[PDB]
Amino acid sequence: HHSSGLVPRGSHMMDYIKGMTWGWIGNSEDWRSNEAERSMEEMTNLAINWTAIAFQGLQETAHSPDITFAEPPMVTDENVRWAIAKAKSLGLSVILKPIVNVRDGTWRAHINFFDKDVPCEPTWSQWFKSYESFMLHYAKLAEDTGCEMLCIGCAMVQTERREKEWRDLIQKVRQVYSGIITYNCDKYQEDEVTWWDAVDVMSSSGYYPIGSWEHHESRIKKIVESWQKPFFFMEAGCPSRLESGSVPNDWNKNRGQIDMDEQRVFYEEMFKFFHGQKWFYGFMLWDWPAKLYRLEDASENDDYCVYGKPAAEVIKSFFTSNK
Amino acid sequence: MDYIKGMTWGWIGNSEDWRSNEAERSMEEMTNLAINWTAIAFQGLQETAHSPDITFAEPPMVTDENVRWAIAKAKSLGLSVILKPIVNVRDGTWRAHINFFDKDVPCEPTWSQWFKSYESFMLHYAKLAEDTGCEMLCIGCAMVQTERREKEWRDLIQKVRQVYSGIITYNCDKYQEDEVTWWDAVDVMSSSGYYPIGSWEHHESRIKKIVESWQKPFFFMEAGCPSRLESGSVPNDWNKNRGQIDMDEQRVFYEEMFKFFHGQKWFYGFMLWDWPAKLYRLEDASENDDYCVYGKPAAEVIKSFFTSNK
Ligand SMILES: OC[C@H]1O[C@@H](O[C@H]2[C@H](O)[C@H](O)[C@H](O)O[C@@H]2CO)[C@@H](O)[C@@H](O)[C@@H]1O
Ligand SMILES: OC[C@H]1O[C@@H](O[C@H]2[C@H](O)[C@H](O)[C@H](O)O[C@@H]2CO)[C@@H](O)[C@@H](O)[C@@H]1O
């Protein structure tokens, strides 16, 4: 079958991940451009051996059951096959990461339905059927393209209690995708997912504030040892902005207030505490755009991207080191 | 407890509307339904379903003077009063989705922050309800995705009891009568009776069993139907078939509801939905698509029920 501990069953293959996320938010026009090719090649200078190909699907509100995918302006199946094959042509292993977003701008962590089925209301059953169609479409693409890993969700906090529905979705994914399955829980939620045993690898969003990494290493170590599964960060990063290090997840904080040093300090601290531990399997960083800004414009860029910034040198020297 | 023959007045709670001369004519006209109670309903506001701060008693919401006016006017007309402060969401999300993570997370709003804000809102109006002699206070309306927060609801009710000495109810949503674990903490159970045409006999049997399991009084804190095509199939859906008038659909809803819910000794009646502070002209009733029954055939079904033998 599939249940296992520290190492996924041989038929699904644990590598130490040196990764960068590519392509977010997933815009067909961006991925089809010439610039996308230059972007992905430049990303390889971080001395990564993995990339997460990340893109969005959409639902209207946090409480609507229908998810749309692979329609304008979202990525086409051809754009996705292109990105996977290009990555593999550059020597990278691939995590496919389909992520549902909400058109009204609500954070997907609030997607939620009543516990009680009510006749005139949307139900969990209707949303999970729609989510299953979305994730099974990309699980089949992941299989066809040889993606080493599939991430079956990202910080879906207010769905995680629906344990039978998550287990049922995973059983369907297993029937069409034979590689490694992970789920990406949100920051602070590593001990709150009751169904970690149903995936191959645990992962979370490492957006822990400056000054907290030593505490989180100790907290996470105990959680991972209690589950006896491999663990890595499926996202970790910080914008190059004033005070972003105190809330590295907050992509809306202090827009246009540039601070290259804040991003650098975040990375130095994260790598000081998370490195070679036998129970830890590395970093999928956040993030790198399909259309990359000019090196000359990097000192004025307020994004998560490390291209042209001091943090890039911290990452490169960590990923090419003997830790 | 009293058998409630009620109509909700003043929603959505607009200071300008309540301060107008028309508000007085509206509440007087409402008394011709042969009601003995009114629910004085008005909104408080939060930005989103996941924000912790509730604003109240600021423009364009009702002033404390507007609220004292409405309560005293109702009482001057011989009505008992339910005070019904209702939180709404500025972005238009239904309040039943107001919700926070079960786990407190440093960079996220918490249940503790929202309940503190909700407590400030409800305790402001609980004190007004005490000062004005309101017979009942309704401490919430269809707050479905908060109801699991049992310790925080009980703590709020303990605070309300210290400042308000009248009857307390909580208004659960349609189909949720058996889902609230803390009914013991209020005096009277209530729900939103928006059950579709063809379902009332079924719901009478369902609700009877729930109420007899709890051994508490029960009544509908809301019940009504817009005068619109097919509204009877989803009487709660205030956005359905706007401007498609059907006086008969509303009448048929009321006739069925009163056929199955009437004099049962475990049942304590109806607070209907609703009646506006600014009432349309009788000549315009035939073209009005609201819940309001004024000038419509359903008003005569209500009057004949409220003045009847049963
Ligand atoms: O959702 C669109 C925004 O995403 C941001 O990154 C988020 C992302 O949703 C992700 O899944 C993760 O958990 O947090 C990331 C950082 O907060 C940014 O890329 C932003 O530019 C997008 O608008
Ligand atoms: O919330 C504003 C709308 O309320 C509607 O009535 C609702 C109301 O919110 C109430 O609490 C209840 O549970 O359902 C009622 C009927 O659907 C209408 O009055 C509408 O006009 C308002 O815009």
Domain chopping of chain B, boundaries: 1-310
B176 CB neighbour count, 10 Å cutoff: 18
**Tokens 């601290």 -> residue:** A269
Q: Tell which of A59, A159, A188, A194 to mutate to test the B interface (max B CBs under 10 Å).
A: A188
CA proximity to A189, closest of A235, A245, A139, A148: A235
The experimental technique behind this entry is X-ray
CA distance A307 to A197: 37
CA distance A85 to A89: 6
Q: Long-range contact list for A63-66, CB < 8 A, 24+ apart?
A: A63/A111, A63/A112, A63/A113, A63/A122, A63/B93, A63/B94, A63/B97, A64/A122, A65/A113, A65/A122, A65/A123, A65/A126, A65/A127, A65/A129, A65/A130, A66/A130
CA proximity to A184, closest of A8, A306, A21: A21
Residue type, B45: L
B106 CB neighbour count, 10 Å cutoff: 12
Which residues are CB-neighbours of B267 under 8 A, at least 6 positions away? B211, B218, B219, B261
E-assigned strands of A242-293? 280-288
Alpha-carbon distance values, B117 to A292, B50, B112, B113 (Å): 44, 13, 9, 6
Closest residue (by CA) to atom 17 of ligand 1? A249
CA distance B225 to B252: 10
Alpha-carbon distance values, B229 to A38, B206, B251, B290 (Å): 59, 28, 12, 12
Contact A116 B175 (CB under 8 A): yes
Angle between helices A163-176 and A124-145 (to 10 degrees): 30
Does residue B207 have its Cβ closer than 6 Å to ligand 2?
no
What would the two tokens of residue A126 be? 């209707």
Q: Could you say which ligand is closest to the alpha carbon of residue A58?
A: 1
Grouping H, G, I as helix, E, B as strand and the rest as coil, residue B85 is strand
**Tokens 């990303």 -> residue:** A43
Angle between helices B200-214 and B247-260 (to 10 degrees): 40
Resolution in A: 1.6
Q: Enumerate residues lining ligand 1, CB below 6 A.
A: A 24-25, 99, 101, 154-155, 205, 235, 249, 251, 286-287
What would the two tokens of residue A83 be? 């990105």
CA distance A8 to A12: 7
Question: Which residues are bridge partners to B175 per DSSP?
Answer: none
Q: Which helix (H) or strand (E) holds A167?
A: helix A163-176
Residue type, B263: G
**Tokens 């995680």 -> residue:** A160
Which residues are CB-neighbours of A66 under 8 A, at least 6 positions away? A59, A60, A130
Q: How far apart are the first and last CA of chain B?
A: 17
Say how many Å lie between the CA of residue B237 and the centre of ligand 2: 8
How open is the CA angle A133-A134-A136, to the nearest 5 degrees? Answer: 65
**Tokens 């970790």 -> residue:** A236
- Contacts B109 to A, Cβ<8 Å: none
Contact B96 A118 (CB under 8 A): no
- Alpha helices (runs of H) in B164-231, residue ranges in sequence order: 200-214
Looking from the CA of A304 toward its CB, the CA atoms found within 13 Å total 23
